[PDB]
Amino acid sequence: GSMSVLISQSVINYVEEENIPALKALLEKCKDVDERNECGQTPLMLAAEQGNVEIVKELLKNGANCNLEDLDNWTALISASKEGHIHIVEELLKSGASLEHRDMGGWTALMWACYKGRTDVVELLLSHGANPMKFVYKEEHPFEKRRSEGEKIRKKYPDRVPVIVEKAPKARIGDLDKKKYLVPSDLTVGQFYFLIRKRIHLRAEDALFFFVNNVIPPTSATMGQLYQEHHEEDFFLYIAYSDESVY
């Protein structure tokens, strides 16, 4: 690692200088194109803000993982979307960049594009399906690891849907011993409320709220319907639970 930051920086220098031949020559000698600078940023993330699509294409061609995040949970897609680099955004989406990843502030790439008035980027992101608290499971496992697990679960147990359930930040309620659930698609949201309440060992007077994508799901919906509406791109459905203290 004594050299890792230096090699990362030399890559970033050729990105910033937009020196494609020197960049390609160095990348043919790097054992990891995603080696991070001293702030945990990958060359792809810096190229995404720079705005040269050919640099981005070369990095992706050499194996750059567009779903990596820095210490602010920022991604290449959020950088390109904030700066309005429409062709970079398109290349990242083609490589499988997650649309709904949020930065440390809770903002997605679409929210950044709207904030900055990036008209074409907004249309592109919506065209690819962008939807118009941080889960420990999401924060502590890289996106593509989670996506492989979710795809495995969808293949092996097609009658059921995978759900991650976690307690909302600083809620006056007991904790769950297990966070991973696999439930029949025709189980209703109400039945799932009851299952989670039983696992937390609550009294009938103790309130329990569910939140998915910051909204309360109707109890008459099935978990399969909720999943089809709300599942993330790692193929997990994420539900936060709390008592009234979160209000």
From Swiss-Prot:
Quote the record's domain comment: The transmembrane domain mediates interaction with NTRK1.
Q: How is it modified after translation?
A: Tyrosine phosphorylated by NTRK1, NTRK2, EPHB2 and EPHA4. Phosphorylation by NTRK2 is induced by brain-derived neurotrophic factor (BDNF) and neurotrophin-4/5. Phosphorylation by NTRK1 is induced by nerve growth factor (NGF).
Give the shown range, full length included.
1 to 130 of 1762
Cystine pairs: none
Tissue distribution is: Expressed in developing nervous system and in highly plastic areas of the adult brain. Also expressed in neuroendocrine cells, where it concentrates at the tip of neurites. Expressed in developing muscle and is concentrated at the neuromuscular junction (NMS). SNTA1 can regulate its localization in the NMS.
Query: Cellular location of this protein?
Result: Membrane; Late endosome
Instruction: Relate the protein's function as given in its record.
Output: Promotes a prolonged MAP-kinase signaling by neurotrophins through activation of a Rap1-dependent mechanism. Provides a docking site for the CRKL-C3G complex, resulting in Rap1-dependent sustained ERK activation. May play an important role in regulating postsynaptic signal transduction through the syntrophin-mediated localization of receptor tyrosine kinases such as EPHA4. In cooperation with SNTA1 can enhance EPHA4-induced JAK/STAT activation. Plays a role in nerve growth factor (NGF)-induced recruitment of RAPGEF2 to late endosomes and neurite outgrowth.
Gene it is expressed from: Kidins220
Name the domain of life this protein comes from. Answer: Eukaryota
Start and stop residues of the ANK repeats: 47-76, 80-109, 113-132
Complex and partners: Found in a complex, at least composed of KIDINS220, MAGI2, NTRK1 and RAPGEF2; the complex is mainly formed at late endosomes in a nerve growth factor (NGF)-dependent manner. Interacts with RAPGEF2; the interaction is strengthened after NGF stimulation. Isoform 2 interacts (via C-terminal domain) with MAGI2 isoform 1 (via PDZ domain). Interacts with NTRK1, NTRK2, NTRK3, ERKL and NGFR. Can form a ternary complex with NGFR and NTRK1 and this complex is affected by the expression levels of KIDINS220/ARMS. An increase in KIDINS220/ARMS expression leads to a decreased association of NGFR and NTRK1.
The protein here is known as Kinase D-interacting substrate of 220 kDa
